[PDB]
Structure 1
């Protein structure tokens, strides 16, 4: 069925030894195509992103490309660890643009107590200057994004009350209602342990195309695909049984976290989806899917 095609056998972005904030790893990047350019807001750590390596701090960098493969990168992070909720940094951003404003949801990792991580919101007009809007849901949660437009006059968000993908609605982004689970793990498969969104969903004629990730019982992360109904995105029209992307290359299989492909961003240019993904929580790669190749067996 659906399979992402890698544009390169090499990463499109790698850590940079000269800059402490991105010395160890760059991964799990937001992505958006705007004004003729691919833009990445990428997660970066000073240390390998696991407790076994040390007290890593995640910050958000900016990179830009004309072709979606060769990137230029800014020397400093566009968002750094500023609040108490962000003591251990900002993780796994997802960005959409609605009416001239970029809405970035990210995980603020505090680690002051058990499950001290929260979905936070920041907005920008330019992807460089970010204004914090605070915690979105005051509960242990992550893997969140707005839909790229309002549905029936309402903001809609995906989130992940472990281990399932959830949806919720809001008039003003301040209070949320109609919480319901939309996607769950399937036992004795590649997607048994947990699920979560990839990048933000993409609107097509047949429905909302949503890339999701899942872990198996050996903690191998892969990507999958689902189609949601346009008017009621809680309804799953189709879900592909097989993954669309798996760890295959050396920099996907080996790194700080072995056997991981993980996406927080899918940019669109001329009916081609550019899916950016972290490899082994260490580097960033890219793989494509043409709109016309979005075909579900059901």
Structure 2
């Protein structure tokens, strides 16, 4: 079945000692192909991203590439910790573009009380200047994105009421309705502990192609794939049994958080999907999948 193919045995982006805001880790990046270029909005921390290392703050950087492998990067974050909901920063952005506007959903980590993390929304026309729209769902939640277009006149979002992937609908992005779970962990497998989306889903002629992540009972993170019905994305057409990507290389297995591959971004150019992923919550790699190779076992 479906296996992602690494474009490089080295990371495509790494932390930068000279800049405090991204000195420790760059990971879990949004990705989009636009106007002839691959664009990354990447999560970056000043400290290793676990409480055992310290009070890490996540900020969002910008990088750009012609080929999807070799990146140039801006020296300052395009979004920084500004609100109370963002006391400990902004995490794990997912971006789609609808009618000339980029919609980014990210985790605002406050850590003022138990489960003080919230899905937040920001919009942009240019990926540099972001306007905050506030909390999307006022509840402990993350792993969220819009679908890249309206379905039957409505905005559609994926979210993650622990430990399951959920879907919901909205007329205006302000109020959400028709919440329902669509994907759950499976006991005694690689995907037993929890599930959550990767990057935003991608429209194909056979359905919505959605990459997801899961953790096993040792907290090893891997990626998998599902296909959702076009008109009712709450309906799962197919779910591949085996992972599409697992920690294999040294920088996937070792880092601040061991044995993690984790995606928040899948850019598309000429029928090739470029899946960007965090390795060990420390660096960013890329792996590809050609659209024609999206096949689920009949």
- Normalised by the length of structure 2, the TM-score is 1.00
Deviation, 1:164, is 0.1
Deviation, 1:185, is 0.1
Deviation, 1:262, is 0.0
Deviation, 1:283, is 0.1
Task: State the Cα deviation string for residues 89-139 of structure 1 (Å, max 9, x = none).
Answer: 000000000000000000000000000000000000000000000000000
Deviation, 1:245, is 0.1
Q: What is the distance in 2 between the residues matched to 1:274 and 1:230?
A: 22
Q: What is the distance in 2 between the residues matched to 1:296 and 1:122?
A: 35
Deviation, 1:191, is 0.1
Q: What is the distance in 2 between the residues matched to 1:31 and 1:297?
A: 28
- Secondary structure in structure 2 of the residue aligned to 1:251: helix
Deviation, 1:51, is 0.1
Deviation, 1:202, is 0.1
- Secondary structure in structure 1 of the residue aligned to 2:252: helix
Deviation, 1:249, is 0.1
Deviation, 1:81, is 0.1
Q: What is the distance in 1 between the residues matched to 2:196 and 2:82?
A: 26
Task: State the Cα deviation string for residues 253-284 of structure 1 (Å, max 9, x = none).
Answer: 00000000000000000000000000000000
Q: What is the distance in 2 between the residues matched to 1:190 and 1:200?
A: 22
Q: What is the distance in 2 between the residues matched to 1:64 and 1:76?
A: 14
Deviation, 1:77, is 0.1
Deviation, 1:182, is 0.1
Deviation, 1:11, is 0.1
> Which 5+ residue runs of structure 1 have no aligned equivalent?
none
Q: What is the distance in 1 between the residues matched to 2:296 and 2:37?
A: 30
RMSD: 0.2
Q: What is the distance in 2 between the residues matched to 1:96 and 1:196?
A: 17
Deviation, 1:84, is 0.1
- Secondary structure in structure 2 of the residue aligned to 1:252: helix
Q: What is the distance in 1 between the residues matched to 2:73 and 2:160?
A: 31
Q: What is the distance in 2 between the residues matched to 1:209 and 1:2?
A: 12
The equivalent of 1:218 in structure 2 is 218
Q: What is the distance in 2 between the residues matched to 1:252 and 1:243?
A: 15
Deviation, 1:87, is 0.1
- Normalised by the length of structure 1, the TM-score is 1.00
> Which 5+ residue runs of structure 2 have no aligned equivalent?
none
- Secondary structure in structure 2 of the residue aligned to 1:255: coil
Deviation, 1:7, is 0.1
Deviation, 1:40, is 0.1
- Secondary structure in structure 2 of the residue aligned to 1:21: helix
